[PDB]
Design an enzyme around this catalytic site. Structure first.
Site, short mmCIF file in Angstrom:
data_model
loop_
_atom_site.label_atom_id
_atom_site.label_comp_id
_atom_site.label_asym_id
_atom_site.label_seq_id
_atom_site.Cartn_x
_atom_site.Cartn_y
_atom_site.Cartn_z
N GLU D 68 -0.65 3.26 -1.40
CA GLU D 68 -0.73 2.04 -2.04
C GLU D 68 -0.31 0.80 -1.09
OE1 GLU D 68 -0.74 0.64 -4.79
OE2 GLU D 68 -1.80 2.43 -5.72
N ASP D 69 -0.81 0.95 0.21
CA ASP D 69 -1.00 -0.23 1.17
C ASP D 69 0.09 -0.06 2.30
OD1 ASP D 69 -2.98 -1.32 -0.37
OD2 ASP D 69 -1.78 -2.85 -1.53
N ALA D 70 0.98 1.01 2.16
CA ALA D 70 1.90 1.11 3.06
C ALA D 70 1.07 1.62 4.55
CB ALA D 70 2.79 2.18 2.78
#
Ligand code: 4QM
Ligand code: MG
Ligand code: ZN
Ligand code: ZN
Ligand code: ZN
Lengths: 69, 49, 334, 389, 92, 45, 49, 243, 102, 50, 49
Positions: D68-70
């Site tokens: 999730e975009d991390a």
RNA sequence: CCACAGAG
């Protein structure tokens, strides 16, 4: 600001190669793609370490409050 | 035809088969023709005369 | 067998398969006689700051352990603490201290001792564990300069504060044990700072030794990595003009042509960074295949100047052995 | 999204950025040129004053911490100076000259018998204004003030106490006078911040994310030459967001840095992909930029090639130092006898109407009663049974 | 000319007493922080910074079962992490 | 004890308490306090 | 036994704030339900909202 | 949630809990409340707990499940052409349970050339690590993409791409785990069946095991996207132009 | 004198008869776990051997070893450590000989 | 006193080379076009009307 | 711009349906003890289970 | 007390 002492990705010392790279650019009139390889910068991380650097300390040093401009 | 012409171990195709992220339409838009853009249910309005 | 194949999209057979329970016959047990018979080392090149040696018939786990221990377990000396007096430069105190901490130092850390932290600051540093460096540079306007030039090296006297300005200040018995081996930066041309008239930098750096896991400045290797030896299998011989195209699919020293037959042969594989460009073209499909030897590691250890690279590899091997011995000798408790 | 979020990039502000004393300023220690430029960048002189660094990114799923975009930063890369930033804040004060022929004063200092000042004045100096280059911790004083109490003349203390979660350093102390003849003192505090968990990193194609984990460089993958990636991003952010320009930028940057020349990515044009493939092939890499990386943990070959190359990232001003907050018991509003708002005033979080609705939906009566009555504004009152008032 | 604030103005709107201080209100013992993933954590677990856990306190009543634990927490103090920030005596 | 520097002329000077915020070598009214002489330490990170 | 157990434990538990759950279960799909053009069974101009 | 203490100045929650929050790690700020009474604390943990709220009340479907990058790794492990020997299988089992659960290795699916296990057997061990575990589930389910078999009379499990999962006993006899068997929004997922059959604790345990395995596996088995996955073939540029 | 906190035996996971165990090692990481796993898997009586890092923010390592019904797990761990020591010794000796050769 | 806008024809930074721009503690790569009032620097944004 | 209208609708729904509950006689009743439904949904089954 | 500016 100033050239980093070490390359971010691998860790090769590239702070000393900046002056030599500038000298090879100016008085030897070589393209930078050869001057980078002449100074032992084999990996492209060390290449981007000084190919992409901006020498901002020269621009900053004009505004020196310790001496009259 | 674009989805049929993609081999296995193609990362967007795998991520569409899994359902984790993306879909068939996104791969079709990236690799093949994107398609007609629709604004408010119609095509692009005449912004000029 | 032990050849990891290379395909146009995937890499197959990438795991070790030499242990009992992998097959019915249950061979390839651990027998140190067999390992001593089969394992080999070939040092192809060795300079004052770089080593290139091949380990043969060793498992991937051991080589990776050696690489990791070389990167972040061999101790080395680096500038830890910086004390500042009158730093009027444009470069801030934190940035300058970081840059001083990042330089390598040409000392042997076997002549120093680890630093205890629980002792107070007035007793933590002794003569057995710290090296004191002094930097003291004051810039001034150079009066006798050529008027037709604007070179910063000529307009001023100390415009470029280099790394060799970090002089070594002995403390106590270091005046004796550091006689023929004075402390010096490994690369003296590192540009620490830039100055203009009216500015001064003076500082004392306390230098201790640490591991690379704590900070990256303590890693004694600039580079420590291995690659598997490539291998090219030409199944059907390739003749004529296409063979030259085959020669174009690889780095120049890799594959040559035999003038007695006008066919391609593998001149050398060690010069081949695996680019698998030959797998792009259908005219070479099912004619040539690519692989790597899963138990033939070419290391390339480029040191930071503090050590010879063979010393670093030996230190890594000894550190792994000491880890194993310490775990063996420790008791087991519930 | 990139048009909106490129205005929050941390980088060099101006050539005279060190002579300025602004209310909040963000600077970067080592800015770098973009590997892939644009003609618009050349015309607006963004080249001279960049904001961001080129990072060797390996688009792969290294761990579970990039979901999730991390992003997955590199500890050694951060140690050597990647993403190092500093923040400068300005505190101003005016010695008002009151109408009673009385004026405020700056001077004042308290010294212990041993020859040391009091701890609250440890970095105050003999002129009541914080010494340049001295560390200021939480609770210390850098501007000492004393106002007259009758507007000889007595003084009451109103010092400017520094408060913050991390120590700072005084950079400049400027004294002046305005036209109306009041002493004006401006103190510039700078502090150095390194990336940690929670720091936002953009990608110049949207693709924002925070640093989910910081891992040592012996755990990250590495290619044959020994190059270890600095930031590892999750591949799953590409297919839904459909940013092919990011892959083109990576390959263009790789081919440019191998050739040694910056490559132009001007809109409706730029340097084509085929020339990048030709340069990469002539340099010995793959034509699509996907290299073979050895895993850092298990040590063996990765079963799939990893997309590998330089991408220009920017560090954004939303760092976790200015976002973390916790109240427990603190100040309260006078009118409503409820906790205040804003972390500057040490306020507390608001349980709004819909949070109350969700707690209702669970049916937890006692928890709702504790959250909205006991822990916020409980008050014992006496009510009359006869009249109800 | 700025309109004044009346009682009807104080009781109406998103900032009035009914929708701003009675239906929902700001509460104590709360913290707001940026999030980041952690797969090695169980799904019924959230990781809290120790810099927040040193501030947010739980009031536990001393009993015959946790007397030693709370004594150790009081001994530790409010600087090390496992510890206490306040004590309230029974009769006080 | 020199403690203040004028902004533009760069002449180090000390302010007596009964004197205005003004450089005496010019008419400038910006004074930057000079760097302290006390020791300050920094960890190299 | 399994069917009877599932049915007997699937009955609505008394005390449940079922109105609150229903209100939320109708409201929150409105967030995810983006505007999209609709027509009623093969005729284009009916443009049902 | 239950609190844990970690030193990094950011709240951390498992990614499987991201979906009910609708949270993405792109700068999201989230709130933490601490109840101050025993009654409130007990009501919070026994009514608003993650284990007791695996199902959204809107429709009853799971909403707490495998998000993206957990479905992908689980699919790659459960792919048809993935085989593991004893060493790699044992390493996979050690990563999913932190070396705390006692496993018992089932007989391998391939024996004569080598002793090779299948990733579907790895997930069979993921659901039921040993005989002491009580989790026994059975389910037949379709996948997100499903190609029908070569004839109209064959059962659905004999599909061409193996997009039909059959779980009998506790083994996974067919199909690949994707966002119809481990994800959210469907009432025939593995975790939903485990929940409805043996309470929330076993579902949480299996979920944690899957999350740990998919977190620690894809690092040692790379999975990347590049322009080679997006560039069209030579023949597509002609057919697209003609159409 | 010996560091009793270095390596522990987790009693919650070990079998009662000792044929399986799950040791916990403090202040270590993959660089020992991978080598130990590879060496222990070459023991013919070892049926299960695997390491893990339960959380990267803490320095800890969990290694699980299960054998057949002929030897215990502690014996397998000690034999693996001894074999790792011998392997490092052989590598050291070969490198010393070849560096003396050049 | 009419507040001058920076880099106008009435400002001191008009047609100034970077040496004289450095003499006045001003960045040469600054767009100008803003009013310095009371210490702060404010910009009159371009308005759009029917 | 969808968020304002969607949140307003959700708030209105939740203010309307906040008082309903399933009493112990399996009848959904308001706060003022008036029956809305005699059984929830006609069969008294929670959609959760 | 308002108004900007960003973060979901
Ligand atoms: C206290 C630790 C001592 C240690 C650092 C000393 C003592 C033994 C030394 C090695 C042996 O001499 C054999 C080799 C000789 C070659 O010339 C250079 C390399 C070589 C591997 C040596 C390196 C190093 O010098 C060692 C390990
Ligand atoms: Mg978001
Ligand atoms: Zn490098
Ligand atoms: Zn009364
Ligand atoms: Zn002056």
């Amino acid at each position: 600001m100033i050239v980093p002492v070490r390359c971010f990705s691998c860790g090769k010392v590239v702070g000393d190669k900046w002056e030599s790279y500038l000298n090879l650019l100016q008085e030897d009139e070589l393209d930078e793609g050869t001057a980078l390889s002449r100074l032992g910068l084999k990996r492209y991380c060390c290449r981007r370490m000084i190919l992409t650097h901006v020498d901002l300390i020269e621009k900053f040093l004009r505004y020196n409050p310790l001496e009259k401009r | 035809v674009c989805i049929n012409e993609l081999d296995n171990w193609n990362a967007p195709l795998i991520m569409a088969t899994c359902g984790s992220k993306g879909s068939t339409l996104n791969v079709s838009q990236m690799v093949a023709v994107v398609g007609q853009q629709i604004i408010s249910g119609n095509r692009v309005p005449d912004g000029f005369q | 067998s032990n050849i990891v194949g290379i395909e146009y999209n995937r890499v197959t057979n990438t795991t070790s398969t030499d242990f009992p329970g992998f097959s019915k016959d249950a061979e390839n047990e651990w027998n140190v006689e067999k390992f001593k018979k089969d394992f080999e080392v070939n040092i192809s090149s060795l300079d004052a700051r770089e080593a290139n040696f091949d380990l043969i018939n060793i498992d991937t786990s051991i080589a990776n352990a050696f690489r990791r221990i070389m990167i972040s377990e061999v101790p080395s000396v680096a500038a830890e603490y910086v004390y500042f007096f009158n730093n009027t430069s444009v470069i801030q105190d934190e940035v300058l201290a970081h840059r001083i901490g990042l330089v390598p130092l040409k000392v042997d850390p076997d002549m120093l001792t680890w630093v205890d932290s629980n002792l107070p600051d007035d007793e933590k540093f002794t003569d057995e564990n710290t090296i004191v460096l002094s930097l003291n540079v004051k810039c001034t306007r150079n009066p006798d300069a050529p008027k037709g030039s604007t070179d910063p090296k000529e307009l001023y006297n100390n415009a470029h504060v280099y790394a060799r300005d970090l002089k070594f200040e002995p403390q106590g018995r270091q005046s004796t044990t550091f006689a023929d081996c004075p402390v010096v930066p490994a690369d003296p041309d590192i540009l620490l700072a830039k100055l203009r008239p009216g500015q001064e930098i003076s500082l004392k750096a306390h230098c201790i030794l640490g591991i690379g896991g704590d900070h990256a400045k303590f890693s004694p290797v600039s580079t420590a990595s291995y690659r598997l030896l490539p291998q090219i299998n030409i199944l059907q011989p390739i003749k004529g003009e296409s063979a030259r195209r085959f020669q174009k699919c690889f780095p120049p020293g890799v594959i040559g042509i035999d003038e007695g037959s006008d066919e391609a042969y593998v001149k050398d594989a060690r010069k081949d960074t695996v680019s698998r460009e030959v797998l792009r073209y259908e005219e070479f499909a099912d004619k040539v295949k690519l692989g790597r030897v899963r138990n033939h590691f070419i290391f390339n250890v480029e040191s930071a100047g503090a050590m010879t690279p063979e010393e670093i590899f030996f230190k890594s091997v000894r550190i792994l052995k000491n880890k194993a011995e310490y775990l063996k000798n420790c008791p087991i408790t519930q | 999204y990139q048009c909106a979020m490129g205005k929050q990039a941390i980088g060099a502000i101006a050539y005279n950025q060190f002579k300025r004393i602004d209310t909040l300023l963000y600077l970067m220690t080592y800015p770098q040129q973009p590997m892939v430029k644009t003609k618009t960048i050349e015309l607006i002189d963004y080249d001279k004053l960049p904001a961001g660094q080129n990072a060797t990114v390996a688009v792969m799923s290294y761990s579970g911490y990039d979901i999730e975009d991390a992003l997955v930063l590199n500890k050694s890369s951060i140690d050597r100076g990647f993403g190092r930033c500093e923040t400068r804040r300005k505190t101003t004060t005016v010695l008002k000259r009151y109408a009673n022929h009385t004026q405020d004063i700056i001077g004042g200092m308290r010294v212990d018998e041993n020859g040391d000042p009091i701890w609250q004045h440890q970095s105050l100096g003999p002129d009541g204004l914080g010494e340049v280059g001295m560390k200021v911790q939480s609770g210390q004083i850098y501007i000492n003030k004393s106002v007259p109490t009758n507007s000889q003349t007595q003084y009451r203390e109103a010092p400017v106490i520094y408060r913050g979660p991390e120590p700072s350093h005084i950079d400049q102390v400027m004294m002046s006078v305005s036209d109306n003849d009041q002493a004006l003192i401006k103190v510039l505090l700078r502090q150095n911040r390194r990336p940690e968990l929670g720091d936002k990193f953009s990608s110049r194609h949207g693709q924002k994310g925070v640093c989910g984990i910081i891992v040592k460089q012996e755990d990250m993958p590495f290619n044959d030459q020994g190059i270890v990636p600095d930031i590892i991003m999750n591949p799953h952010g590409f297919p839904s967001r459909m940013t092919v320009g990011k892959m083109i930028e990576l390959i263009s940057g790789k081919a440019g840095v191998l050739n040694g020349t910056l490559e132009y990515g001007t809109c409706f044009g730029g340097s084509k992909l085929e020339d990048m493939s030709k340069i990469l092939v002539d340099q010995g890499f793959n034509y699509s930029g996907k290299d073979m990386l050895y895993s850092g943990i298990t040590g063996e070959c990765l079963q799939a090639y990893i997309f590998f190359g330089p991408i220009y990232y920017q560090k954004l001003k939303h760092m976790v130092l200015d976002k973390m907050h916790a109240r427990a018991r603190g100040p309260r509003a006078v009118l409503t006898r409820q906790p205040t708002e804003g972390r500057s005033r040490d306020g507390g979080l608001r349980l709004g109407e819909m949070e109350r609705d969700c707690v209702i939906a669970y049916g937890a009566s006692q928890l709702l009663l504790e959250r909205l009555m006991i822990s916020s504004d409980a008050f014992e009152v006496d009510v009359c049974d006869k009249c109800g008032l | 000319v700025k309109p004044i604030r009346g009682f009807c103005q104080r009781l109406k709107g998103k900032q009035g007493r009914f929708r701003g201080n009675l239906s929902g209100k700001r509460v104590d013992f709360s913290g707001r922080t940026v999030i980041s993933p952690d797969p090695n954590l169980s799904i019924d677990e959230v990781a809290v910074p120790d810099r927040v856990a040193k501030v947010l306190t739980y009031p536990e009543k001393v009993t015959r079962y946790n007397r030693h634990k709370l004594q150790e927490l009081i001994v530790n103090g409010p600087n090390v992490h496992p510890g206490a920030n306040y004590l309230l005596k029974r009769n006080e | 004890t020199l403690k203040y520097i004028c902004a533009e002329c760069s002449s180090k000077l000390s302010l007596s308490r009964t004197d205005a915020v003004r450089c005496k070598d010019c008419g400038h009214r910006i004074l930057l306090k000079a760097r302290t002489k006390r020791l300050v330490q920094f960890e190299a990170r | 036994e399994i069917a009877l157990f599932k049915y007997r434990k699937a009955r609505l538990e008394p005390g449940t704030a079922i109105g609150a759950i229903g209100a939320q279960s109708i409201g929150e799909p409105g967030t995810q339900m983006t505007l999209k053009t609709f027509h009623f069974a093969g005729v284009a101009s009916m443009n049902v909202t | 949630h239950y609190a844990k203490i970690r030193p990094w100045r950011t709240f951390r929650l498992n990614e499987c809990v991201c979906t009910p929050y609708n949270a993405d790690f792109d700068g999201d700020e989230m709130n933490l409340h601490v109840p101050q009474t025993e009654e409130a604390r007990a009501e919070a943990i026994n009514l608003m707990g993650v284990k007791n709220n695996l199902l959204t009340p809107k429709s009853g479907e799971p909403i707490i499940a495998a998000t993206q990058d957990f479905i992908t790794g689980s699919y790659l492990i459960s792919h048809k052409d993935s085989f593991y020997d004893r060493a790699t299988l044992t390493q996979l089992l050690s990563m999913m349970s932190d070396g705390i659960e006692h496993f018992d290795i089932p007989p391998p699916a391939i024996m004569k050339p080598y002793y090779l296990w299948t990733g579907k057997q790895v997930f069979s061990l993921l659901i039921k690590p040993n005989h002491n575990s009580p989790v026994v589930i059975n389910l037949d389910a379709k996948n997100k993409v499903f190609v029908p078999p070569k004839s109209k009379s064959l059962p659905n499990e004999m599909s061409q791409n193996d997009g039909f999962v059959i779980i009998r006993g506790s083994q996974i006899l067919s199909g690949v785990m994707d966002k119809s068997v481990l994800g959210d929004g469907k009432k025939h997922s593995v975790f939903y069946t485990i929940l409805r059959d043996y309470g929330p604790q076993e579902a949480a345990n299996a979920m944690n095991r899957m999350a740990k395995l998919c977190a620690r596996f894809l690092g040692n088995r790379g999975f990347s996207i590049g322009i080679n996955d997006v560039t069209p073939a030579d023949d597509l540029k002609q057919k697209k132009e003609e159409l | 004198e010996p560091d009793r906190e270095k390596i522990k035996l987790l009693t919650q996971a070990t079998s009662e008869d000792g044929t399986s165990a799950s040791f916990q090692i403090v202040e270590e990481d993959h660089t020992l776990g991978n080598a130990l796993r590879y060496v222990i898997m070459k023991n013919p009586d070892v049926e299960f051997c695997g390491y893990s890092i339960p959380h990267p923010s803490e320095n800890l390592l969990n290694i699980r070893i299960q054998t057949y019904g002929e030897t215990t797990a502690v014996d397998a761990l000690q034999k693996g450590l001894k074999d790792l020591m011998d392997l490092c010794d052989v590598v050291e000796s070969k490198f010393t000989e070849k560096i003396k050769s050049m | 006193r009419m507040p001058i806008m920076l880099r106008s024809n009435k400002c001191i930074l008009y047609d100034a080379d970077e040496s004289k721009m450095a003499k006045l503690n001003e960045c040469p790569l600054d767009p100008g076009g803003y009013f310095i009032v009371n210490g702060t620097e404010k910009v009159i944004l371009v308005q759009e009307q029917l | 711009v969808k968020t304002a209208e969607t949140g307003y609708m959700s708030r209105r729904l939740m203010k309307s349906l906040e008082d309903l509950s399933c009493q112990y006689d399996n009848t959904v009743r308001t706060s003022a003890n008036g029956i809305v439904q005699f059984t929830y949904g006609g069969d008294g089954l929670d959609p959760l289970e």
